[PDB]
Amino acid sequence: ASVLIVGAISLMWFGEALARSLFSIMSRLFDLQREEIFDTAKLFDIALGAMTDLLFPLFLVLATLFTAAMI
Amino acid sequence: DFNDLLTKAINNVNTLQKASG
Amino acid sequence: MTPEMFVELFREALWMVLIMVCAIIIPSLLIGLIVAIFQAATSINEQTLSFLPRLIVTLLALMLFGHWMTQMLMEYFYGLIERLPQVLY
Amino acid sequence: MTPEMFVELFREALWMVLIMVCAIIIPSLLIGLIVAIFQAATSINEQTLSFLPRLIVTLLALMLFGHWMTQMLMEYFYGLIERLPQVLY
Amino acid sequence: MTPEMFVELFREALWMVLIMVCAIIIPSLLIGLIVAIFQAATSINEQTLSFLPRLIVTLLALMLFGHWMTQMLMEYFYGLIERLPQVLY
Amino acid sequence: MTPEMFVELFREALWMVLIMVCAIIIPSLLIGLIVAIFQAATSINEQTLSFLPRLIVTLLALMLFGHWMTQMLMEYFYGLIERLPQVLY
Amino acid sequence: VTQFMIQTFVLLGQILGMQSSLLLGQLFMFLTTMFFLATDGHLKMLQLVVFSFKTLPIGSGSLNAVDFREMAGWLGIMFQTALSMSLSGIIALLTINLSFGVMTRAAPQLNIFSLGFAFALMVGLLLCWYILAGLYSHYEMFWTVGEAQICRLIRL
Amino acid sequence: TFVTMSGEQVDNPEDVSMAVLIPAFITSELKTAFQIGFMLFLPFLIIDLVVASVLMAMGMMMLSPMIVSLPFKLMLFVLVDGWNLILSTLAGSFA
Amino acid sequence: EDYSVTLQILALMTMLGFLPAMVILMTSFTRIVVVMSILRQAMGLQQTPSNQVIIGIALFLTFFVMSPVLNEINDKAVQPYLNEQVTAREAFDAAQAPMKAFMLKQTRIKDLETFVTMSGEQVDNPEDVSMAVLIPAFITSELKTAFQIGFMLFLPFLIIDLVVASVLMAMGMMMLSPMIVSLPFKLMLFVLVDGWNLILSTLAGSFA
Amino acid sequence: EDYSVTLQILALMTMLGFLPAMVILMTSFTRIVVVMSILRQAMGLQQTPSNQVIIGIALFLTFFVMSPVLNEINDKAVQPYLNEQVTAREAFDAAQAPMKAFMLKQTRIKDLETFVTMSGEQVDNPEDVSMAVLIPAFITSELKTAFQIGFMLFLPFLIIDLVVASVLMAMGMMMLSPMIVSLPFKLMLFVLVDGWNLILSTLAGSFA
Amino acid sequence: TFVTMSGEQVDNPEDVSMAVLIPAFITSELKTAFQIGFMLFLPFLIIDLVVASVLMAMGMMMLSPMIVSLPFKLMLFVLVDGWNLILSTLAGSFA
């Protein structure tokens, strides 16, 4: 019961930043140039970049879930 | 070759129409 | 083709999928035991704390072995093309 | 066809899948039971832990019985073909 | 078509499927309950441990009830054909 | 006529199907909770156990509410037919 | 343009149905067709095309590139309008399902699976009853947006 | 609408020309037919929603509701004597 | 030498019969539909946008992006032909060239090499290759390009779905399907960023 | 005594009437179409490439791979016929011979064996068999060959699907559907391997 | 069935009228076709059932067995040489 509450509490502040993280990923992956589309290597680099930029905010929220779970 | 087969056929029809007209 | 060619092809994919999945789930499995013995030491019966360490290590495995896995599958796609004339021979 | 002939065909088809499915799952069933006993012996309960051994063993079972499954299926298809003239009359 | 006859055909159809589905599921439901009881007694939490036994008894049930289910389906079709003059006078 | 009257018709129709689906489902929902709480009390963890009990009551509910649901669909059709003058006027 | 509006309501029907753990587009499609007929939408379109003859003569005049891009941008109009109509209901669908999940999460023996299927669909049908209660106002605003686009095409 | 589109000045409805009355007649009859027809559609849509939700209640998400609803759709039409009910109202609808 | 009026009419009606092929094999229709197919598939909606509006939007999008080439055909070919400045044979060639130039701008060198060797012909300049060989190379490049764009469009929706699933699992509720919760979030993030307008810019401008 | 001009025209007009049958049975069209169909179903996309584009690609491919036999017909049966060098009956035989030879190179002896026995004709050499027997044997061989190639291309996509499902099941998120997440990787692998150019090249090289 | 329906007096089957044989012949062909089809359906059904249960054993209840089963369905038809076996049996079914 406590774990889900703190997650909702975390979504109050961390969720807004997570919403910003999702906003940036969609905006970048939608706005592509002619040079970026025709290069396979550049697509994978942005795929890794969007992947890693997601991890940091997601890890913080899940850590906020883990920390309250032990306590 | 085979591509020119259609071109020759159309030209003959055009020539026959041109002479007839 | 021949029944033996199918088994050769079937095993190679089965060996490939086994290697592809094992590289990622091995680190998560070990971390699960490490969290399990930690919860055995403190006698805490919570079962949701272990999700985060597995998820973090799983992404770490994907980042470390991402190029190797993609290259292995890409070369596997080329390999079937190379052996395609042999089957159709 | 006679209803008894239909049940015969139905039974041998269900027997075919039962033999095939058990030969593949029984190795996974035993491994899952072994891991569960080991977890109980060390007083841990991790649901996701007993997945890597089952997946690998099942893949090994599929590779080992590749020729056996193909032989069983090919002979079963021939058996129905050869049993067809008996039915149509 | 009177509404009373429509409900009678609806009920007899639902009664037939209920009899058939219950006769098949019950052997799997009993085995699944037995394995679940066994797991609780020995305090293990494997999930898919109670899948293969359910599949085996379900397939075995279909083999044993093949004659019974076939006869009832044939009887039901014959009954509706014979009941046709009553439906439309 | 006016679009609002069409909304009232469509809300009325959706209201009826809510009554139809509630009469069928609620008997199955109650049995699902009864079995689930019983398993929780007895520490039984068979997830697929509570399927046939829900199916049995669902089929029984259809047979029990056969007359009422008929009377209701037919009268709804007559209600719309007698409401056609609204459209013509 | 007319197909865009109706299919957007079909979009509204299916998003509610998908969120309702579930043909519901047809229910909205039929009702939206009634809205089109009841509001004399067909008469307005006929008035629009005859007005097109006046302000957009047959001889000199055709759709330019900008008209094609404006008409191609109506997919975003669909999702924005469909989400706007269903945002209140979709939040209601999520919060009750999340509330049901957290409230029954105490005992992992119950779970939801098919039991959750029954609960979700009953509430989803009930929410669609609320959606039909206030759908007419959304249609009126949607028609104004669509009609303005049509006049832009005919340069009226 | 049509007298405005035709651009003719007529003070009363009963003096409109036949050139503008014919398109006005079919346009109105199309609206009437669509409104009458889709109301008949509603009871058959009710059956579809009921059976589909029931099938989804048991987790049978792969069974197509349309084949299951088809026998019941036919029964609803024959129980209400549909082929006589629609024609009687259609005949009485005109004036 | 020039085709007679009767023969020119026959050619005109023939191209009208093949008009659906020219849209889906020579213009940008194939890339737009495939990309829009991915967008519908990426979101939880299966048939919700429906096939009719996607084709209709694709047709209008093609007329937008083909407007430069269509106008170039109009000026170079149609105008001299209408004014009887040039004969029908050269007018047809003057109309074919802008289509060939546009297909070259959307193809790859590797694709052309494969088909020119496949046809078993001799050529040294890509600019004067037969249109019969350019068409298969054009669509092959279009399909590969569309998959690239679709893959990039699929990533953000996969990102959202994985986050929601992880959050639900981390909260302990291993019983709730992530799809139902994730669908509004995918739709909300598709609207508040005005996703379709961004897709229009990266699709219409992708040709240039 | 070659066929009269009126009968020669009547025969040629009949062959144009059966042109769809000749393409779909006596040519390489069927194998390419089936392999493309298997590949499309192998991925998560149901009908994203669309049926008209698939047939359009196959029509160009089947024309290129059969250009050698098409030229051989022209150089041995059409040009001598137009130059008044061969009897019309001889020219028809000269056109049929390369077509029969091509179909024999892509047929299986088991297919010939069963159809020859089915027709009940006493023929030994596998070169003087009738077209009535050769065509069903050829189309049967093309279907079987297409299935083998279709299975070959299907395996890598099956590997991705199993890996994604296994990884998701490792994290305990059994409720998450593997198909939605698997699809972008299926597009990913097919595009960095240059699939479209690769498959059409292999299909072109297959007929040999 | 058709002799009693046609109301004719027939002593032996080998002298029935053509008008009473054509409906009977096509009826028997349809029934015989279904029996042969059921024979061929079983091997592919068994593969589908086998792969569906194996996937369910490993706990993945969301992966569709149809996608996984398809490569094996094709292979079974290949290494058995289906397009020669099926056609030979169909031709041999009239002897």
PDB file of C-alpha atoms in Angstrom, chain K:
ATOM      1  CA  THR K   1     -32.396 -39.191 -51.630  1.00  0.00           C
ATOM      2  CA  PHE K   2     -32.973 -37.628 -55.052  1.00  0.00           C
ATOM      3  CA  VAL K   3     -34.740 -40.668 -56.536  1.00  0.00           C
ATOM      4  CA  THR K   4     -37.420 -40.458 -53.844  1.00  0.00           C
ATOM      5  CA  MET K   5     -37.513 -36.688 -54.379  1.00  0.00           C
ATOM      6  CA  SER K   6     -37.908 -36.953 -58.163  1.00  0.00           C
ATOM      7  CA  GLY K   7     -40.805 -39.394 -57.784  1.00  0.00           C
ATOM      8  CA  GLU K   8     -39.572 -41.778 -60.482  1.00  0.00           C
ATOM      9  CA  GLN K   9     -39.598 -45.581 -60.413  1.00  0.00           C
ATOM     10  CA  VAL K  10     -35.958 -46.710 -60.560  1.00  0.00           C
ATOM     11  CA  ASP K  11     -34.925 -50.360 -60.266  1.00  0.00           C
ATOM     12  CA  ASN K  12     -31.126 -50.076 -60.503  1.00  0.00           C
ATOM     13  CA  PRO K  13     -28.740 -47.149 -59.938  1.00  0.00           C
ATOM     14  CA  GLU K  14     -26.957 -47.718 -63.268  1.00  0.00           C
ATOM     15  CA  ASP K  15     -30.011 -46.492 -65.235  1.00  0.00           C
ATOM     16  CA  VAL K  16     -31.083 -43.364 -63.329  1.00  0.00           C
ATOM     17  CA  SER K  17     -31.895 -40.219 -65.285  1.00  0.00           C
ATOM     18  CA  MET K  18     -29.268 -37.536 -65.814  1.00  0.00           C
ATOM     19  CA  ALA K  19     -31.381 -34.899 -64.052  1.00  0.00           C
ATOM     20  CA  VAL K  20     -31.419 -37.061 -60.897  1.00  0.00           C
ATOM     21  CA  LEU K  21     -27.696 -37.936 -61.056  1.00  0.00           C
ATOM     22  CA  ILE K  22     -26.084 -34.491 -61.393  1.00  0.00           C
ATOM     23  CA  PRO K  23     -27.431 -33.151 -58.050  1.00  0.00           C
ATOM     24  CA  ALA K  24     -26.498 -36.445 -56.382  1.00  0.00           C
ATOM     25  CA  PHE K  25     -22.994 -36.561 -57.874  1.00  0.00           C
ATOM     26  CA  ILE K  26     -22.100 -33.015 -56.814  1.00  0.00           C
ATOM     27  CA  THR K  27     -23.529 -33.729 -53.352  1.00  0.00           C
ATOM     28  CA  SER K  28     -21.268 -36.759 -52.903  1.00  0.00           C
ATOM     29  CA  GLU K  29     -18.245 -34.862 -54.238  1.00  0.00           C
ATOM     30  CA  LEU K  30     -18.728 -32.095 -51.663  1.00  0.00           C
ATOM     31  CA  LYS K  31     -19.008 -34.644 -48.846  1.00  0.00           C
ATOM     32  CA  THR K  32     -15.971 -36.575 -50.094  1.00  0.00           C
ATOM     33  CA  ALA K  33     -14.035 -33.309 -50.387  1.00  0.00           C
ATOM     34  CA  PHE K  34     -14.703 -32.497 -46.725  1.00  0.00           C
ATOM     35  CA  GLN K  35     -13.375 -35.883 -45.588  1.00  0.00           C
ATOM     36  CA  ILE K  36     -10.113 -35.406 -47.498  1.00  0.00           C
ATOM     37  CA  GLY K  37      -9.816 -31.857 -46.175  1.00  0.00           C
ATOM     38  CA  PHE K  38     -10.182 -33.043 -42.581  1.00  0.00           C
ATOM     39  CA  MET K  39      -7.303 -35.474 -43.140  1.00  0.00           C
ATOM     40  CA  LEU K  40      -4.987 -32.668 -44.261  1.00  0.00           C
ATOM     41  CA  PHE K  41      -6.168 -30.241 -41.567  1.00  0.00           C
ATOM     42  CA  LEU K  42      -5.093 -32.452 -38.645  1.00  0.00           C
ATOM     43  CA  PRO K  43      -1.270 -32.364 -39.123  1.00  0.00           C
ATOM     44  CA  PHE K  44      -1.244 -28.560 -39.261  1.00  0.00           C
ATOM     45  CA  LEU K  45      -3.667 -28.400 -36.329  1.00  0.00           C
ATOM     46  CA  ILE K  46      -1.364 -30.633 -34.270  1.00  0.00           C
ATOM     47  CA  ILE K  47       1.602 -28.343 -34.964  1.00  0.00           C
ATOM     48  CA  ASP K  48      -0.466 -25.321 -33.925  1.00  0.00           C
ATOM     49  CA  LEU K  49      -1.557 -27.044 -30.707  1.00  0.00           C
ATOM     50  CA  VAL K  50       1.991 -28.214 -29.936  1.00  0.00           C
ATOM     51  CA  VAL K  51       3.587 -24.788 -30.368  1.00  0.00           C
ATOM     52  CA  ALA K  52       0.759 -23.062 -28.484  1.00  0.00           C
ATOM     53  CA  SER K  53       1.215 -25.289 -25.431  1.00  0.00           C
ATOM     54  CA  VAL K  54       5.014 -24.951 -25.464  1.00  0.00           C
ATOM     55  CA  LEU K  55       4.737 -21.155 -25.453  1.00  0.00           C
ATOM     56  CA  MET K  56       2.160 -21.320 -22.653  1.00  0.00           C
ATOM     57  CA  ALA K  57       4.424 -23.588 -20.586  1.00  0.00           C
ATOM     58  CA  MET K  58       7.184 -20.957 -20.579  1.00  0.00           C
ATOM     59  CA  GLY K  59       4.684 -18.400 -19.248  1.00  0.00           C
ATOM     60  CA  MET K  60       4.290 -16.125 -22.294  1.00  0.00           C
ATOM     61  CA  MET K  61       0.508 -15.948 -22.681  1.00  0.00           C
ATOM     62  CA  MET K  62       0.604 -12.889 -24.966  1.00  0.00           C
ATOM     63  CA  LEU K  63       2.634 -14.270 -27.897  1.00  0.00           C
ATOM     64  CA  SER K  64       0.368 -15.431 -30.712  1.00  0.00           C
ATOM     65  CA  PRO K  65       1.052 -19.082 -31.645  1.00  0.00           C
ATOM     66  CA  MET K  66      -0.034 -18.427 -35.247  1.00  0.00           C
ATOM     67  CA  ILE K  67       3.099 -16.410 -36.049  1.00  0.00           C
ATOM     68  CA  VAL K  68       5.396 -18.993 -34.448  1.00  0.00           C
ATOM     69  CA  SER K  69       3.584 -21.978 -35.976  1.00  0.00           C
ATOM     70  CA  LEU K  70       3.629 -20.655 -39.557  1.00  0.00           C
ATOM     71  CA  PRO K  71       7.287 -21.504 -40.416  1.00  0.00           C
ATOM     72  CA  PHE K  72       6.787 -25.072 -39.194  1.00  0.00           C
ATOM     73  CA  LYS K  73       3.494 -25.439 -41.068  1.00  0.00           C
ATOM     74  CA  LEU K  74       5.293 -24.475 -44.278  1.00  0.00           C
ATOM     75  CA  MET K  75       8.223 -26.801 -43.572  1.00  0.00           C
ATOM     76  CA  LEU K  76       5.949 -29.781 -42.905  1.00  0.00           C
ATOM     77  CA  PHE K  77       4.388 -29.224 -46.328  1.00  0.00           C
ATOM     78  CA  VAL K  78       7.868 -29.002 -47.895  1.00  0.00           C
ATOM     79  CA  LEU K  79       9.906 -31.953 -46.607  1.00  0.00           C
ATOM     80  CA  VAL K  80       6.831 -34.178 -47.051  1.00  0.00           C
ATOM     81  CA  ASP K  81       6.605 -32.858 -50.647  1.00  0.00           C
ATOM     82  CA  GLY K  82       3.023 -31.745 -50.189  1.00  0.00           C
ATOM     83  CA  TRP K  83       2.320 -30.280 -53.621  1.00  0.00           C
ATOM     84  CA  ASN K  84       3.140 -33.676 -55.156  1.00  0.00           C
ATOM     85  CA  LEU K  85       1.582 -35.850 -52.440  1.00  0.00           C
ATOM     86  CA  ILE K  86      -1.733 -33.977 -52.278  1.00  0.00           C
ATOM     87  CA  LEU K  87      -2.267 -33.774 -56.041  1.00  0.00           C
ATOM     88  CA  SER K  88      -1.378 -37.437 -56.593  1.00  0.00           C
ATOM     89  CA  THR K  89      -3.885 -38.487 -53.924  1.00  0.00           C
ATOM     90  CA  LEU K  90      -6.580 -36.256 -55.432  1.00  0.00           C
ATOM     91  CA  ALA K  91      -5.955 -37.744 -58.877  1.00  0.00           C
ATOM     92  CA  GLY K  92      -5.787 -41.220 -57.337  1.00  0.00           C
ATOM     93  CA  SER K  93      -9.042 -40.650 -55.443  1.00  0.00           C
ATOM     94  CA  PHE K  94     -10.986 -41.220 -58.697  1.00  0.00           C
ATOM     95  CA  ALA K  95      -9.584 -44.717 -59.270  1.00  0.00           C
TER      96      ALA K  95
END
